[PDB]
Amino acid sequence: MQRIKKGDKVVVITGKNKGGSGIVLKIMPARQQAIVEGLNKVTRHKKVQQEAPIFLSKLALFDQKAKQQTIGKIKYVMDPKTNKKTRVFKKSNNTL
Amino acid sequence: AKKDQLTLRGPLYGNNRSHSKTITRRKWNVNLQPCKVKTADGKTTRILVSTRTLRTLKKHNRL
Amino acid sequence: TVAKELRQKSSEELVKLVIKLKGELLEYRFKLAHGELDKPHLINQTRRLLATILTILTERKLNWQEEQANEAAVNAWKQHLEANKAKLLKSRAKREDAS
Amino acid sequence: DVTNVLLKPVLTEKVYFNQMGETKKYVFVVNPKASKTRVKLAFELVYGIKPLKVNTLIRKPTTIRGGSRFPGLSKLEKLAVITLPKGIAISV
RNA sequence: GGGUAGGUGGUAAGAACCUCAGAUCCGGAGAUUUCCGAAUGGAGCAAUCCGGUAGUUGGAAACAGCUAUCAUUAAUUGAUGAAUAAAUAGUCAAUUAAAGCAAUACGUGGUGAAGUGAAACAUCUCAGUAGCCACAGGAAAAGAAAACGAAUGUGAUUCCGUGUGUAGUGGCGAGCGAAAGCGGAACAGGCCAAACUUAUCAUUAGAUAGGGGUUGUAGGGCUUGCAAUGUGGACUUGAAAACGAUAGAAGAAGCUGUUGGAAAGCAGCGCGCAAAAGGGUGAUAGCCCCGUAUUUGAAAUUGUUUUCAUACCUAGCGAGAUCCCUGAGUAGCUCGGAAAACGUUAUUUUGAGUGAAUCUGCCCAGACCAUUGGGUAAGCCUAAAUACUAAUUAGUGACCGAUA
RNA sequence: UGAGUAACGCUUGGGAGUGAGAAUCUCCCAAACCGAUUGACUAAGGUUUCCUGGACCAGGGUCGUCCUUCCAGGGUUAGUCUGGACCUAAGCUGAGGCUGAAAAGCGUAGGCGAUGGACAACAGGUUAAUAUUCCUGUACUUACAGUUAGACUGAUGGAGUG
RNA sequence: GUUAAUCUAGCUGUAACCAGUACCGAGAACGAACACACGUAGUCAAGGAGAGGAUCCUAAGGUUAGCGAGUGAACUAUAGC
Ligand SMILES: [Mg+2]
Ligand SMILES: [Mg+2]
Ligand SMILES: [Mg+2]
Ligand SMILES: [Mg+2]
Ligand SMILES: [Mg+2]
Ligand SMILES: [Mg+2]
Ligand SMILES: [Mg+2]
Ligand SMILES: [Mg+2]
């Protein structure tokens, strides 16, 4: 399954941008891109302030139910007794 | 071909070693004869048969 | 979207479905020749549907063919026919009048 | 009768110039493997009007895109004009 | 079946759509699969032209749609059938089979040179090579001693090392080069003809189908007994088990600072390891991501091995008795050639001719004879060691890095 | 380097116009050569080279607004024309067959093979591009069915003609 | 064939298949590596004088030979004497 799914909150780890929380819009898995809304605006001088894809390695999930809104890794293991595969943090126990 | 049709004994290839032992290819052709023969249903037929096989047939009384 | 026509009467009415689908497929392509075909996406879907129905037919010992077991055009053909009649009558009349 | 012999109608200025006559010579491009009898039978089955005459021609493939580092070949197609009785017309 | 949330093959944006009632995608199984092409209804200048027959629909009919079928050869079967009475050839019909391609690689067989060296050249050599042709196989070929050979000897074939550059062969020139013996890889030997006998053939069988027998310390058949019900297959069916092959899933560990456009660099303080292979991430990341070690995963197809029952085949030891059988245009021999390391020589092979013996037999131990000893030809088959890699998967390199 | 050297591979003048750019493009007037041909129809051959609109990187032995160059769109219509569905010549192919180490070679019945034979359409008009094809006018030929009148029809073979 | 076919003739009606059809056809679209003075079947083939398709000028029709402008020396070629 995919670590990043279109529609969730996410931040950037490295680059000129830091801590850029935003909603992801599109994923190009064959070339490992992600379109995060509201960040990395390449000023196209058409013959605009659209955004440009950021690599999956830079992106990292962002928890909201934690008191300390930190950034951590993920596990696909946690399978509900009455449901299918899910996401869960490693140094925590909070689904997605 | 120049081979009989009871067996398939065809020509043979060797060398024409003349005096002083020079080499030249030459063909040995089996001796074929058209002597007739009678099958055991009637159907007496004429076929090209080698003389050695003619002797074999003669001594076996196949005519 | 395939098992839903296995349940359906997969022996007779499917050829009527196929001939219909052929009808609007041909009409869609003819409109595509001109403009005014605002939904080109229909062609691929209808071709795919033909493919599915033909597969459902060919799994069975059947063929979509041989299962089949004009208002004013006739008037225009008529007028053409008596026009030809009048021309032939005039021609024969003149030819015999020459003699 | 499969109606896989009526590929497309073509609309060119020559076609229109023939349309503003009175016979209304409709034209189509057809399956190259088909024949005039098949074309007229298909036309009868698809519209209901028995044609008056059918004429055909085929455009041989030619070099297309000229010199463009990837030249290709054009399409071999057969055109079948379909005359009608003088007093009739239909859409397409 | 797996797997999810994006997708509509690349130069590619857009538009218009599909998609979380499970898409796209990946694996297994399928169907569709125009024309040419071995091309095979007939032609033809390949991808075109012209058909016949039997159905079916429309038409009043030619005809037109929709299907099916029609090459040749060989074998089998049936019908028909002349010169001529029968009978044969021939004719027609029905069933089965290849008929082609390539893996520029291996195998066997048929045929088969020159250029070159000999310091020229014909004998030789190159070389039974190259090429052409036929036949295939997953390997093929060979193969169960009428053997090697010198012995109180081994005991199918095949491949490797040695023997060895030896014995030998050679215008005794250039050159060529074993067979034993030994050490190893592998290991399985079976089955017909023949007498004898059963049945059936105008039983003139001289033929067909059964049982019996398959050979060298000769065996088998013939008469009469004894002992056995087994071990084994180069072996049939299923059932069961196991390990796989073709998609996958889980899969640890890090922050700060500085230089800097960017840190993953460097420094400080930590952590994981059955995972310090790799790739990517804005500069060189064990802890950012995909993966990796490790553990697991098959609805369907398929491979291998094991077990069970199960066909088929396979079974030892005596006594009598001039009884019979043991592969004939065959072995030898003559004249020409050839293979064997031999350039014609015992051994093997054959184009022409000639042509035996039958266990007190026949052949052999590099002319030939005798003694001694060895082995039983003129019938068939057989896996393993062996040769190769166009193809699939994984991987490797003191291999190349855009004149390589 | 040879070197900005030989060469640029059968001919003009002018007016007007376009355009940024004019000897070379368009129009106009002359002029000069061809005129048993540089004139018109076509076979084979080429395969879009044809027409319209646009462009002047590259090609044009110079220039270019222009080209047989490049881009975009368009254009060939047959019962009677040329060929096949008809016929054979030289020749090819060839069931059986004969012959040959193998491949193959020869050849019979058959089957192909026009450069020839038989076979029904003419004048005019029309578009930028087609025209015995499209259109108008006039005809002709062959099949097929029905109907009417008459008549006995006659081949896969024979004969004449061809 | 005869309890009829088949043919001839007329009338009514139906049908007539496949491939080529553009353009050039040559001192610029073909064969000559070329916008190369070369080669390429057939057909149409006007007037004057002329036997004539010979020759000269022309008719129908077509072209501006895809580098020019100057000077008019040597020298070269082709003409004229
Ligand atoms: Mg100059
Ligand atoms: Mg100079
Ligand atoms: Mg000079
Ligand atoms: Mg000069
Ligand atoms: Mg010329
Ligand atoms: Mg000519
Ligand atoms: Mg004249
Ligand atoms: Mg002249």
D23 touches strand F (CB under 7 A): yes
A90: DSSP letter: S
Burial A7-26 (b: 16+ CB within 10 A, else e): eeebbbeeeeeeebebebee
Cα–Cα distance, A26 to A5 (Å, whole number): 9
C-D interface (Cβ pairs under 8 Å ≥ 3): yes
Contact present, D1 and D37 (Cβ < 8 Å): no
Task: Kindly state the tokens that stand for D16.
Answer: 């229109």
What contacts D62, CB < 8 A, 6 or more positions away? D73, D74
Domain boundaries, chain A: 1-96
Picking from D7, D46, D87, the nearest residue to C79 by CB comes out as: D87
What contacts D7, CB < 8 A, 6 or more positions away? C29, D28, D29, D30, D31, D77
Q: Using CB atoms and an 8 Å cut-off, which of residues 50-89 of chain D contact chain C? A: 50, 52, 84-88
Burial of D81 (0-12, 13-18, 19+ CB in 10 A): middle
Q: How far is CA A23 from CA A3, A20, C89, in A?
A: 14, 10, 88
Please report the beta strands in chain D, taking only residues with DSSP state E, as ranges in sequence order. 26-30, 54-59, 63-64, 72-73, 77-82
Structure determination technique employed:
cryo-EM
How many domains does chain B contain in total? 1
Residues of chain D neighbouring C75 (CB-CB closer than 8 A)? 87
B44: DSSP letter: E
Maximum separation of any 2 CA atoms in chain D, in Å: 52
C69 touches strand E (CB under 7 A): yes
Half-sphere exposure of D35 (CA within 13 A, CB side): 1
D33 touches strand G (CB under 7 A): no
C16: DSSP letter: H
CA of C30 to the centre of ligand 2 (A): 74
C81 touches strand G (CB under 7 A): yes
CA(B1)–C1'(G71) in Å?
Answer: 93
CA(A5)–C1'(E263) in Å?
Answer: 28
Q: Which of D46, D84, D88 to mutate to test the interface with C (most CBs of C within 10 A)?
A: D88
Contact present, B50 and B9 (Cβ < 8 Å): yes
What contacts C45, CB < 8 A, 6 or more positions away? none
Domain boundaries, chain D: 1-92
Picking from D7, D10, D87, the nearest residue to C76 by CB comes out as: D87
D20: DSSP letter: T
One-letter identity of residue C76: A
DSSP C60-89: TT--SSS-----SHHHHHHHHHHHHHHHHH
Contact D3 C30 (CB under 8 A): no
CA(D45)–C1'(G9) in Å?
Answer: 40
Any idea which residue has 């009678």 for tokens?
A: B38
Half-sphere exposure of C2 (CA within 13 A, CB side): 10
Burial of B28 (0-12, 13-18, 19+ CB in 10 A): exposed
Give the nearest chain D residue to C30 (CA atoms).
D8
Q: Whole domain around residue B8: which residue ranges?
A: 1-63
Q: Give the pairing of strands B36-39 and A22-28.
A: unpaired
Contact C76 D85 (CB under 8 A): yes
Task: Kindly state the tokens that stand for A55.
Answer: 């690599």
